[PDB]
Design an enzyme around this catalytic site. Structure first.
Site, PDB file in Angstrom:
ATOM      1  N   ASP A  20      -0.459  -7.310   1.648  1.00 10.28           N
ATOM      2  CA  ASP A  20      -0.079  -6.034   1.673  1.00 10.28           C
ATOM      3  C   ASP A  20       1.335  -6.330   1.962  1.00 10.28           C
ATOM      4  OD1 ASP A  20       0.055  -3.465   1.680  1.00 10.28           O
ATOM      5  OD2 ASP A  20      -0.697  -2.983   3.751  1.00 10.28           O
ATOM      6  N   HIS A  42       1.131  -1.366  -0.117  1.00 10.89           N
ATOM      7  CA  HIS A  42       0.196   0.086  -0.107  1.00 10.89           C
ATOM      8  C   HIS A  42       0.908   1.003  -0.283  1.00 10.89           C
ATOM      9  CE1 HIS A  42       0.485  -0.069   4.378  1.00 10.89           C
ATOM     10  NE2 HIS A  42       0.420   1.284   4.291  1.00 10.89           N
ATOM     11  N   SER A 102       3.381   2.333   9.026  1.00 14.46           N
ATOM     12  CA  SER A 102       2.875   1.237   8.124  1.00 14.46           C
ATOM     13  C   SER A 102       4.237   0.910   7.443  1.00 14.46           C
ATOM     14  CB  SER A 102       1.734   1.916   6.940  1.00 14.46           C
ATOM     15  OG  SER A 102       2.146   2.746   6.153  1.00 14.46           O
ATOM     16  N   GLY A 127       1.693   6.300   9.901  1.00 11.58           N
ATOM     17  CA  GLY A 127       3.001   6.530   9.343  1.00 11.58           C
ATOM     18  C   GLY A 127       3.871   5.572  10.118  1.00 11.58           C
TER      19      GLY A 127
END
Lengths: 10, 245
Positions: free
Chosen positions: B96, B45, B197, B195
């Site tokens: 992801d 992502h 991730s 922030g």
């Protein structure tokens, strides 16, 4: 962006 | 990171800081982990809104975001690989995970140091149990309702949450599947946030720090019955080996 995102760009 | 403490890369020396270039200094965008000398693992992502490898720059060895750190190493992204089944579904992400091949202005891969190390991938299997307490780290917000970000690295400790518990309707219901990992604090006071991730979830398996998960989603930060959700790295081992091996 899906609602529960933790991404800075969302 | 909500809760926890401020710390130096020496305590998370696999941490990778992924920034996006600008038209003119680059913008911090999300975290990652050095899983081998030429390869950083992160979240897909992080790369969708602009999936071109030339637009990103990866720093290893940083305690302070967007400034120079002694022992820093700066890399260009040689190759950007997103999982073929990546997908967004209105609440969450699926599959992801991303792989970045990194390289320096002069050709080199990552040079080990006290502030730059690799982190182990989880084994195929393992007998003998381990603790469900795992570490998180990143430059994310310190509370879900902050404007503004901390600028200095933070770290904290969360407990793994069983799939069964994470799937209860009060939690995340059927959005959680076997490819995800849930982790929260039993008193709901420490969590990853916006922030953080792409950053790592470090469990301690067979005695060594292990990259068990990648920060992917969760509703807010440190909310009751809303664990953080992580890409379950062990599920993608064959995929990872087939790209970096």
């Amino acid at each position: 962006c899906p609602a529960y995102s933790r991404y800075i760009g969302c | 990171i909500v809760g926890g403490e401020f710390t130096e890369v020496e305590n998370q020396p696999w941490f990778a800081a992924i920034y996006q270039k600008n038209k003119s200094p680059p913008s911090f965008k999300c975290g990652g982990s050095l899983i081998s000398p030429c390869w950083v693992a992160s979240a897909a992502h992080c790369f969708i809104q602009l999936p071109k490898k030339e637009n990103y720059v990866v720093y290893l060895g940083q305690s302070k975001e967007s400034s120079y750190n002694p022992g820093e190493m700066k890399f260009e992204v040689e190759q950007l690989i997103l999982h073929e089944y990546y997908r967004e579904d209105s609440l969450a992400y699926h599959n992801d995970i991303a792989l970045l091949k990194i390289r320096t202005s002069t050709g080199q891969c990552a040079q080990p140091s006290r502030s730059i190390q690799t982190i182990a991938l989880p084994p195929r299997f393992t007998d003998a149990p381990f603790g469900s307490d795992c570490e998180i780290t990143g430059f994310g917000k310190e509370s879900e309702s902050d404007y503004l970000y901390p600028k200095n690295l933070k770290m904290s400790v969360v407990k793994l949450v069983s799939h069964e518990q994470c799937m209860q309707p009060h939690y995340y219901g059927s959005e959680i599947n076997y490819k995800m990992l849930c982790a929260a604090d039993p008193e709901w006071k420490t969590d990853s946030c916006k922030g953080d991730s792409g950053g790592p979830l470090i469990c301690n398996i067979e005695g060594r720090p292990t990259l068990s998960g990648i920060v992917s989603w969760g509703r807010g930060c440190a909310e009751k019955n809303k664990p953080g959700v992580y890409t379950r790295v062990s599920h993608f081992l064959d995929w990872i080996q087939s790209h970096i091996g």
